[PDB]
């Protein structure tokens with residue numbers, strides 16, 4: 139999680155898309171969706187990012203509709219944005235035990251139990267928190283079984299990005315679970 143305000147420069151694809159849906163939260167604008175292999179993904183926009191400006195206009199108090207409107211009108215050639223990185227999220231680094239567990243239980247992405255004397259317990263993992271990312275890979279909308287698989291196929295060191303469940307549930311309001319499963323970018327980021 140980068141701790142300040144960064145600039146990104148986007149270019150609409152051939153179809154006039156940038157691969158983004160935005161959501162009004164708390165009189166700010168936040169990324170709700172980033173499409174796989176989109177301009178948004180390529181420049182490193184992530185679920186939960188806060189859009190502070192689009193082409194030098196403040197996003198404060200915009201509706202989701204106005205934000206999507208503003209992206210439609212923009213000259214495709216070059217869109218600038220100012221971004222706060224995942225400001226509602228935090229990162230937690232854990233170490234797997236000899237049996238391959240970081241030490242928590244979760245249901246529909248939300249951590250529900252912390253196991254006594256686990257890495258999760260020592261690193262202060264919290265319940266009623268939704269898993270957004272595992273080792274920088276977005277897992278939002280993936281089945282519980284696949285999130286377990288991605289945890290099992292990570293090394294002994296597991297970084298998990300988490301969001302308070304209330305906040306997460308407010309952000310994904312009005313996005314179909316199939317769009318999340320199907321289109322939400324879940325690739326290991328390119329270099």
Ligand SMILES: COc1ccc(C2(C(=O)O)CCOCC2)cc1
Pocket residue numbers: 231232233256257260261
């Ligand atoms: C007393 O507080 C702590 C905090 C972290 C740990 C480690 C972990 O499990 O993450 C131990 C193994 O290596 C990494 C760190 C241990 C004790």
